From Swiss-Prot, chain A:
Keywords: Ribonucleoprotein, Ribosomal protein, RNA-binding, rRNA-binding. Belongs to the universal ribosomal protein uL15 family. This is Large ribosomal subunit protein uL15. One of its GO terms (cellular component) is cytosolic large ribosomal subunit. The chain holds residues 50 to 145 of 146 of the full protein.
Swiss-Prot record, chain B:
NCBIfam families: rpmI_bact. GO terms for cellular component: cytosolic large ribosomal subunit. Residues 1-21 are annotated as: Disordered. It comes from Mycobacterium bovis (strain BCG / Pasteur 1173P2). PANTHER family: 54S RIBOSOMAL PROTEIN BL35M, LARGE RIBOSOMAL SUBUNIT PROTEIN BL35M. It comes from the Bacteria. This is Large ribosomal subunit protein bL35. The lineage of its organism: Bacteria, Bacillati, Actinomycetota, Actinomycetes, Mycobacteriales.
Amino acid sequence: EGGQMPIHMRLPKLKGFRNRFRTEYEIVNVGDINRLFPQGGAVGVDDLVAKGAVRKNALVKVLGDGKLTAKVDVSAHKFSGSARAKITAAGGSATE
Amino acid sequence: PKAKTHSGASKRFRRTGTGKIVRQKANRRHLLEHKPSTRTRRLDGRTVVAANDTKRVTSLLN
RNA sequence: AAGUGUCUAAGGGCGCAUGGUGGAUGCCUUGGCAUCGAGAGCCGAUGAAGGACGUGGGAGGCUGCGAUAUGCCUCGGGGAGCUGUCAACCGAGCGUGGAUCCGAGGAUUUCCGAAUGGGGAAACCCAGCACGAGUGAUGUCGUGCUACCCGCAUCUGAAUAUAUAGGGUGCGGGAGGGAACGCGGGGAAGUGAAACAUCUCAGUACCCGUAGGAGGAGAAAACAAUUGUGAUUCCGCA
RNA sequence: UAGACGGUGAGAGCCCGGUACGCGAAAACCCGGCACCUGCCUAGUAUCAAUUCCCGAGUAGCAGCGGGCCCGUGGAAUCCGCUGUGAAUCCGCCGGGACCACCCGGUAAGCCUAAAUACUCCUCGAUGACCGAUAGCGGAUUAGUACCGUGAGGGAAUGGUGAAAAGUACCCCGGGAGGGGAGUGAAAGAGUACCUGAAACCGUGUGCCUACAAUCCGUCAGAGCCUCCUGGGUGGUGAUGGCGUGCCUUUUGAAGAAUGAGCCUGCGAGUCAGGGACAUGUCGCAAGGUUAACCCGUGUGGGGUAGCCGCAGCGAAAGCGAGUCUGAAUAGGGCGACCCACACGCGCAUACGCGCGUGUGAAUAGUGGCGUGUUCUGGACCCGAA
RNA sequence: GGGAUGAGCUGUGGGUAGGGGUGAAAGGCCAAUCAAACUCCGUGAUAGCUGGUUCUCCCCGAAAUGCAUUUAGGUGCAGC
RNA sequence: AUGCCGUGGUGUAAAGCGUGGCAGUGAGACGGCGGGGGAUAAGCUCCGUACGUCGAAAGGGAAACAGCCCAGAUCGCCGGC
RNA sequence: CGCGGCACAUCCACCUUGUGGUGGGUGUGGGUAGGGGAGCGUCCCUCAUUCAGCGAAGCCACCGGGUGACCGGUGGUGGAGGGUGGGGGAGUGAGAAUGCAGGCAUGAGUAGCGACAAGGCAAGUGAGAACCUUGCCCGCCGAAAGACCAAGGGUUCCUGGGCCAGGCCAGUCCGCCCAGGGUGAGUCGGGACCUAAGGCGAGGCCGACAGGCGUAGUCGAUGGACAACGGGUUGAUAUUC
RNA sequence: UACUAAAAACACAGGUCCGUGCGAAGUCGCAAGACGAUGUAUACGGACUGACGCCUGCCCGGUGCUGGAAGGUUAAGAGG
RNA sequence: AAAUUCCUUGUCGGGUAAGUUCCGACCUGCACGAAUGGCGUAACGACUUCUCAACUGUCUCAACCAUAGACUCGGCGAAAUUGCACUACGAGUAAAGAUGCUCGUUACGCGCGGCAGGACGAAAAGACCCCGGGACCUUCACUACAACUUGGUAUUGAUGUGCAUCUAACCUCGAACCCUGAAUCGGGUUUAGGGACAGUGCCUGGCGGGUAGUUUAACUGGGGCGGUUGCCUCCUAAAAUGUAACGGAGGCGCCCAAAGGUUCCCUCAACCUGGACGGCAAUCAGGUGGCGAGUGUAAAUGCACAAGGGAGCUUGACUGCGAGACUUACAAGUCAAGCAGGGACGAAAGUCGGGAUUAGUGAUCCGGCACCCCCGAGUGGAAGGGGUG
Ligand SMILES: [Mg+2]
Ligand SMILES: [Mg+2]
Ligand SMILES: [Mg+2]
Ligand SMILES: [Mg+2]
Ligand SMILES: [Mg+2]
Ligand SMILES: [Mg+2]
Ligand SMILES: [Mg+2]
Ligand SMILES: [Mg+2]
Ligand SMILES: [Mg+2]
Ligand SMILES: [Mg+2]
Ligand SMILES: [Mg+2]
Ligand SMILES: [Mg+2]
Ligand SMILES: [Mg+2]
Ligand SMILES: [Mg+2]
Ligand SMILES: [Mg+2]
Ligand SMILES: [Mg+2]
Ligand SMILES: [Mg+2]
Ligand SMILES: [Mg+2]
Ligand SMILES: [Mg+2]
Ligand SMILES: [Mg+2]
Ligand SMILES: [Mg+2]
Ligand SMILES: [Mg+2]
Ligand SMILES: [Mg+2]
Ligand SMILES: [Mg+2]
Ligand SMILES: [Mg+2]
Ligand SMILES: [Mg+2]
Ligand SMILES: [Mg+2]
Ligand SMILES: [Mg+2]
Ligand SMILES: [Mg+2]
Ligand SMILES: [Mg+2]
Ligand SMILES: [Mg+2]
Ligand SMILES: [Mg+2]
Ligand SMILES: [Mg+2]
Ligand SMILES: [Mg+2]
Ligand SMILES: [Mg+2]
Ligand SMILES: [Mg+2]
Ligand SMILES: [Mg+2]
Ligand SMILES: [Mg+2]
Ligand SMILES: [Mg+2]
Ligand SMILES: [Mg+2]
Ligand SMILES: [Mg+2]
Ligand SMILES: [Mg+2]
Ligand SMILES: [Mg+2]
Ligand SMILES: [Mg+2]
Ligand SMILES: [Mg+2]
Ligand SMILES: [Mg+2]
Ligand SMILES: [Mg+2]
Ligand SMILES: [Mg+2]
Ligand SMILES: [Mg+2]
Ligand SMILES: [Mg+2]
Ligand SMILES: [Mg+2]
Ligand SMILES: [Mg+2]
Ligand SMILES: [Mg+2]
Ligand SMILES: [Mg+2]
Ligand SMILES: [Mg+2]
Ligand SMILES: [Mg+2]
Ligand SMILES: [Mg+2]
Ligand SMILES: [Mg+2]
Ligand SMILES: [Mg+2]
Ligand SMILES: [Mg+2]
Ligand SMILES: [Mg+2]
Ligand SMILES: [Mg+2]
Ligand SMILES: [Mg+2]
Ligand SMILES: [Mg+2]
Ligand SMILES: [Mg+2]
Ligand SMILES: [Mg+2]
Ligand SMILES: [Mg+2]
Ligand SMILES: [Mg+2]
Ligand SMILES: [Mg+2]
Ligand SMILES: [Mg+2]
Ligand SMILES: [Mg+2]
Ligand SMILES: [Mg+2]
Ligand SMILES: [Mg+2]
Ligand SMILES: [Mg+2]
Ligand SMILES: [Mg+2]
Ligand SMILES: [Mg+2]
Ligand SMILES: [Mg+2]
Ligand SMILES: [Mg+2]
Ligand SMILES: [Mg+2]
Ligand SMILES: [Mg+2]
Ligand SMILES: [Mg+2]
Ligand SMILES: [Mg+2]
Ligand SMILES: [Mg+2]
Ligand SMILES: [Mg+2]
Ligand SMILES: [Mg+2]
Ligand SMILES: [Mg+2]
Ligand SMILES: [Mg+2]
Ligand SMILES: [Mg+2]
Ligand SMILES: [Mg+2]
Ligand SMILES: [Mg+2]
Ligand SMILES: [Mg+2]
Ligand SMILES: [Mg+2]
Ligand SMILES: [Mg+2]
Ligand SMILES: [Mg+2]
Ligand SMILES: [Mg+2]
Ligand SMILES: [Mg+2]
Ligand SMILES: [Mg+2]
Ligand SMILES: [Mg+2]
Ligand SMILES: [Mg+2]
Ligand SMILES: [Mg+2]
Ligand SMILES: [Mg+2]
Ligand SMILES: [Mg+2]
Ligand SMILES: [Mg+2]
Ligand SMILES: [Mg+2]
Ligand SMILES: [Mg+2]
Ligand SMILES: [Mg+2]
Ligand SMILES: [Mg+2]
Ligand SMILES: [Mg+2]
Ligand SMILES: [Mg+2]
Ligand SMILES: [Mg+2]
Ligand SMILES: [Mg+2]
Ligand SMILES: [Mg+2]
Ligand SMILES: [Mg+2]
Ligand SMILES: [Mg+2]
Ligand SMILES: [Mg+2]
Ligand SMILES: [Mg+2]
Ligand SMILES: [Mg+2]
Ligand SMILES: [Mg+2]
Ligand SMILES: [Mg+2]
Ligand SMILES: [Mg+2]
Ligand SMILES: [Mg+2]
Ligand SMILES: [Mg+2]
Ligand SMILES: [Mg+2]
Ligand SMILES: [Mg+2]
Ligand SMILES: [Mg+2]
Ligand SMILES: [Mg+2]
Ligand SMILES: [Mg+2]
Ligand SMILES: [Mg+2]
Ligand SMILES: [Mg+2]
Ligand SMILES: [Mg+2]
Ligand SMILES: [Mg+2]
Ligand SMILES: [Mg+2]
Ligand SMILES: [Mg+2]
Ligand SMILES: [Mg+2]
Ligand SMILES: [Mg+2]
Ligand SMILES: [Mg+2]
Ligand SMILES: [Mg+2]
Ligand SMILES: [Mg+2]
Ligand SMILES: [Mg+2]
Ligand SMILES: [Mg+2]
Ligand SMILES: [Mg+2]
Ligand SMILES: [Mg+2]
Ligand SMILES: [Mg+2]
Ligand SMILES: [Mg+2]
Ligand SMILES: [Mg+2]
Ligand SMILES: [Mg+2]
Ligand SMILES: [Mg+2]
Ligand SMILES: [Mg+2]
Ligand SMILES: [Mg+2]
């Protein structure tokens, strides 16, 4: 910028560190589980990888966006609180 | 070859969920005694990069 | 008398016509460039790579060859022309009793060159020994061998005794070259940092050593993280 | 099974060399087999028990100074070099990023090891939306030659008659050179100065103008001549009148007496690579999209899910999640979600609608390809130092 | 015009080599080049500087300002 | 006085604004008006000016004459104002 | 302003009312840097089609055409490749870089034709003579402008030819071109003898490597040693025959 | 000062100072080695001055050089 | 009065008709001076300088002659340069010096020999100057390195009391002998010495223009020198904002624990009149006096309703925030109601997130400290990192 201290040097670094050991979760929402599994039934990590709501070979957690009207038995990793709330409210089960 | 992203820019800017580029603000690192809390709180947090810095900042991050 | 009134080209301009110069354009090509698929990946003291000087019926160059000199022998192929090419002219010949030509193997292979008998301004000079040839005899000619270092094996064992250094002999080997690719080692600067020293350039260029057909690496003092993988290399990701 | 390619007097499958295809090797070399040969085994095995010994040294470790790894010495781990110090042999030692404990992994200080990888001086066989004589190699030509330099080094230029030399006998001018006539040839409007034969440049002939006029050289107006066709129109010229300060670069501003250009011909400057980056145009598929290496195919085709991008964000992070961070806060703020047009279907509003689901966008929403502009790293539009 | 038996001139053969040589010293000379030779290579060095950058038409059309700048003939952002 | 800010009407196509792609420019000149510096010199210099022209604007006028006055060249006409 | 042509933007009405066309309005069309849009020409490839020895390309002239880059027709020349269209790809366009190569102008029939020794006549040869040959006059050098050697050059030497290049003019001449010929050593100058400076250097010492230095030794004349004189002869050799 | 400077510049004989006790000091080389020198303080090297005559005064504060080591400061090493 | 003297042609004397030069002095030495030698000096000098004689074409002042060119003829036959071209002059105009533009004037076309005023003639991308880059040079610029030097440690040992001695490491370019035939090399053997020193390796301090790479600002009416560089206030500034100059003026790089917050109270300066020390001006009293005083500190805008003066109690000189604004290229800078926590003052209303306001300041990086316990390289820790201040 002609010699004044540039924008990438005037400003401070963003604070903090990145966690080397962070566990990243693929995300599925009970809304899209309802969308992909209208009749309910057993829901597995492999099953919703196959139906395409989640990437393969990753830990997947279920979140609570959208409605659940399906009697669903979802076996995922580390559900959300609202996710279990509406999964059981629809009569299904949420299992690690 | 493959483009190298600018290191200092990558540590001074980040993108939000909708693509806005944010940044923290200068003058909060030291000489804080004479700075009143109104000024330090104005300087606290993150702001969106100025509209006419956006193009160069995006070029640096990309 | 007054007046108006053409015409002329020393040369020059413009346009045509017709030529010259020149070598563009177009179209080519016994030449290149970049690849792909196969090979071959070394040559050298049994003298290399590369040369010098010679060699042909005619002068030179190229090319081939080496005093056996565009050539010698053998084994194959082939079948009528041939005596290479700039490059025509001739001259003189050869060939179905198989030439020219093509393939393979061998023979010859001056001198220089690692060059190595010694010397030297590379392609030159001067030898020693042995065996032959030649002379009346010295002269002279031909062929081998004769560098240094290393290793091995034998003999000897200085000062000095044990001994060793060294020396003698006999076998082997090395040396030098090669476009790229490998490995190990040494290792810039310009440049970039809008200056510049950290940093970069870049372990690049270059250099040294040293290969091989490839090389290096390679068989866990490995990774990994609670079930695990199981030499190395290389490619793609990450 | 031959229409590859080239030659032959002009585009040849049937004319020639060949081509498809089929044969072919004395010998040499290469490859493989059988022998011959060489080497190993014909004596160990199992169990018990863990009393004894064995595992590669000036090495490891440690300290110093360096090097190298993303690590530029940092808390510096692993690895390498030198200096000093200097172990232990499994109830050892090393690594797991200071270190300690535990746990896990492995056995340094000896060597060898194919294949997948790199390269092409060289040999065959092909190929080219490569060049075509100022190009392409410097080199189609005496080419690393000539030439230049003491030397290391530098380093050119020069291709084309014609199908066939049929390369012009003979005669004439001329000392020859050169030419004329003859002759050859389809052509000499191909004559070894040779295919085509542009421009600059140089003549010759010819129409008009031009020796009283001050001219960026033209332009508009315009007589008259000349020419060729039917007074008229072309084409040439241009007496005479007006207007009129070259081109380029670079400048506030140049006709400028600022720069560059004698002329002509040829050559001489935003290119290419990358699943790069951004944005766009377009096309495919679409909550998905797409492969990379690689594999298989005479190809451009078919496989190939590793990966990448999209799919949820917030937070330094643990983490939580349509939320999340700050905060004591059911305070406020930050960032993020409320995703589109048309239609139907539902849990139903009289038929018109909130939400949620099919669908249809084959721009949806992304993703991949291709085009373009810009950009990154490369010489990066080209030329130029000291 | 100076020296011209001398610190003379000159031949032949040799030695010293580039941050080096040599210099009765002028930064002189080291192959017509010397305040660091020449050649090749790094290399197409770099140059905020100078120059050049080639066909056409259609539409629109600036700026020579502010801020900052080891900046002032450059550049970033703004303005247009 | 102008100028400026807001607002309500009226008028006015190529206003404005946001956000992207691609810029160039960042040496200005003179003239009018208001000022500084200078010697109320300079074809001087430095500012201001919803001022102009040149720059990048040909045509007409000013003898000639970027920057003054008139006027903004789409092309053609041997028409007119 | 009038009349006619074009273009851009935008608006209104018909036609598959946006891919958009048609008609009509309205406004607009100076322009450097610069942005955007649309095209011309060259070459190559693919597909289709069509020309071409009854003549392609290229070039030249003339006549025409388009809003521009440019295009077409006809004829001449020429001798083997073109045209058009759908696409694809560029070493795709030059007037400038004191750009590069080649050709050719301008200066200009100009300067100059290289020492201030000096030429002349007669005859000859010849196509051609200031320059060549012969003779004779004249002049110049003569411590060289003569005769030799070394270094260097390399055949320039001699003979016979030649005469378009070269020679600063011309040339019959020539150190030019062509062919043939020519250089004879016991004693000359060198080696086979010797060593100087210096060079190389077995082993060796030193140095990470590369390599440096150096002993023995071996080279290295410009020096030391070493035996020939006089005459004659060829076109060209001679202390050589 | 080859090629615009020949001088008053350089050199010089003479002078002084400093270094050097000997494979010296100095110099060339990483070293070996070499020159110095087949020299040995009447010698060699460096510095300044510049025949000869008369002379060469003051300052040791600064900076060098030479010598000294009482004390202060301090690196590695040891220590811990 | 100089190879030194600026003033300066100093002054005096000499030399000349006339002397800024010359010679001799004077001393007022801008700025002489003793080995960067001082002052002299015979001889010497293609040195510099002044004078005289002689001599002369140097000159007054030129003339003539010969030769080589020039010129003519014949032959051969370049060159630099070149945007063009049937290239006048004057006065103008214009990038401010015109063949080319204006208005005039002058001029038949073309050669030849001459001259050199112009074509800002030709030649070398100005050497001067400035800007950018470079090179080399210097040094008490920076940072390195070589060399030199210091200590530790290894090589490196023994004995006694760091010191001494010893010898065996190591060293010797002391000597002899052998390889060796030829050897001033080398090596070995012996001897004579030195000697755990030296040298060398690693580590380490010093020194180090000897060498190397580099830096050494910009603005600027050219550059240098001088001055300046950020912030605040005013004027310039053309009555919003903004606005340049090396334009005109000043301040700032703090201070205050109260000079902050709050509650309450007060009004100043000056003048006049009277009054022990006391006066023009100390304190007092009374009038008059609305701001002429004061404001921590420049200036401006403000403040008498006070923001000026005084007193009481206090720490809001807060924590978590912050709608919305101003300003602005960006980075920054500025204001902020109001909400909550926990407080201060106040009876309450309320006010308080420093100071009447606007200067008293410094991005990022890299680190430090306190806290929080966020991550913690197999795991538990820890190291280290992170957040907040
Ligand atoms: Mg902080
Ligand atoms: Mg604070
Ligand atoms: Mg051609
Ligand atoms: Mg081999
Ligand atoms: Mg031949
Ligand atoms: Mg031959
Ligand atoms: Mg033989
Ligand atoms: Mg046979
Ligand atoms: Mg044969
Ligand atoms: Mg053979
Ligand atoms: Mg030999
Ligand atoms: Mg030899
Ligand atoms: Mg013995
Ligand atoms: Mg080898
Ligand atoms: Mg560097
Ligand atoms: Mg730099
Ligand atoms: Mg730069
Ligand atoms: Mg191997
Ligand atoms: Mg064919
Ligand atoms: Mg270590
Ligand atoms: Mg390291
Ligand atoms: Mg082991
Ligand atoms: Mg092992
Ligand atoms: Mg191996
Ligand atoms: Mg392998
Ligand atoms: Mg191959
Ligand atoms: Mg081939
Ligand atoms: Mg070529
Ligand atoms: Mg030569
Ligand atoms: Mg004829
Ligand atoms: Mg005829
Ligand atoms: Mg005929
Ligand atoms: Mg023909
Ligand atoms: Mg020709
Ligand atoms: Mg021809
Ligand atoms: Mg007339
Ligand atoms: Mg006139
Ligand atoms: Mg006219
Ligand atoms: Mg301009
Ligand atoms: Mg100017
Ligand atoms: Mg000009
Ligand atoms: Mg001119
Ligand atoms: Mg200029
Ligand atoms: Mg020019
Ligand atoms: Mg995040
Ligand atoms: Mg929120
Ligand atoms: Mg799409
Ligand atoms: Mg492309
Ligand atoms: Mg360049
Ligand atoms: Mg003389
Ligand atoms: Mg004399
Ligand atoms: Mg004399
Ligand atoms: Mg000098
Ligand atoms: Mg020279
Ligand atoms: Mg240099
Ligand atoms: Mg490079
Ligand atoms: Mg416009
Ligand atoms: Mg700065
Ligand atoms: Mg910009
Ligand atoms: Mg600027
Ligand atoms: Mg400016
Ligand atoms: Mg201005
Ligand atoms: Mg004014
Ligand atoms: Mg002005
Ligand atoms: Mg103005
Ligand atoms: Mg105008
Ligand atoms: Mg006008
Ligand atoms: Mg006019
Ligand atoms: Mg009228
Ligand atoms: Mg336009
Ligand atoms: Mg207009
Ligand atoms: Mg433009
Ligand atoms: Mg025909
Ligand atoms: Mg014809
Ligand atoms: Mg063609
Ligand atoms: Mg035509
Ligand atoms: Mg035609
Ligand atoms: Mg034709
Ligand atoms: Mg064509
Ligand atoms: Mg086509
Ligand atoms: Mg195309
Ligand atoms: Mg091109
Ligand atoms: Mg051209
Ligand atoms: Mg040109
Ligand atoms: Mg030329
Ligand atoms: Mg002339
Ligand atoms: Mg003449
Ligand atoms: Mg002559
Ligand atoms: Mg005669
Ligand atoms: Mg005489
Ligand atoms: Mg005499
Ligand atoms: Mg002769
Ligand atoms: Mg003859
Ligand atoms: Mg002749
Ligand atoms: Mg002649
Ligand atoms: Mg040796
Ligand atoms: Mg030697
Ligand atoms: Mg010798
Ligand atoms: Mg000899
Ligand atoms: Mg001799
Ligand atoms: Mg003779
Ligand atoms: Mg000179
Ligand atoms: Mg001279
Ligand atoms: Mg002396
Ligand atoms: Mg002494
Ligand atoms: Mg010494
Ligand atoms: Mg001294
Ligand atoms: Mg002196
Ligand atoms: Mg003294
Ligand atoms: Mg003292
Ligand atoms: Mg004097
Ligand atoms: Mg005087
Ligand atoms: Mg005097
Ligand atoms: Mg002195
Ligand atoms: Mg003196
Ligand atoms: Mg003299
Ligand atoms: Mg005369
Ligand atoms: Mg003449
Ligand atoms: Mg005239
Ligand atoms: Mg004039
Ligand atoms: Mg005039
Ligand atoms: Mg004119
Ligand atoms: Mg004349
Ligand atoms: Mg002149
Ligand atoms: Mg000039
Ligand atoms: Mg210049
Ligand atoms: Mg010093
Ligand atoms: Mg020491
Ligand atoms: Mg030591
Ligand atoms: Mg230096
Ligand atoms: Mg540098
Ligand atoms: Mg400056
Ligand atoms: Mg100034
Ligand atoms: Mg104002
Ligand atoms: Mg105003
Ligand atoms: Mg101040
Ligand atoms: Mg208070
Ligand atoms: Mg108060
Ligand atoms: Mg505070
Ligand atoms: Mg806020
Ligand atoms: Mg409260
Ligand atoms: Mg209370
Ligand atoms: Mg408040
Ligand atoms: Mg204050
Ligand atoms: Mg930094
Ligand atoms: Mg852990
Ligand atoms: Mg660990
Ligand atoms: Mg901690
Ligand atoms: Mg906070």
